[PDB]
Amino acid sequence: ACNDRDCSLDCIMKGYNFGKCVRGSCQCRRTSG
């Protein structure tokens, strides 16, 4: 249960930019500039 809604919201709050569920997991990515 990665819950794309509860996974992206919690990740976007930590300070990341975008993420997604993988193999039933929850990973995110961070961007900069």
The DSSP secondary-structure symbol of 23 reads T
For residue 7, what are the domain limits?
1-33
**For residues 33 and 23, what is the distance between their CA atoms, to the nearest angstrom?**
30
How many other CB atoms are there within 10 angstroms of residue 7's CB atom?
A: 18
Place of tokens 């930019």: 17
**For residues 3 and 13, what is the distance between their CA atoms, to the nearest angstrom?**
15
Token pair belonging to 20: 């997604």
Backbone angles phi, psi at 30, to 5 degrees: -120, 135
Token pair belonging to 17: 């930019």
- Tell me how many domains the chain contains: 1
Residues 6+ apart with CB under 8 A from 20: 4, 7, 8, 27, 28
Asked if 20 and 30 touch (Cβ cutoff 8 Å), the reply is: no
Token pair belonging to 6: 């509860």
Helix, strand, coil abundance in the chain, percent, nearest 5? 35, 30, 35
Token pair belonging to 2: 């990665």
Experimental method: NMR
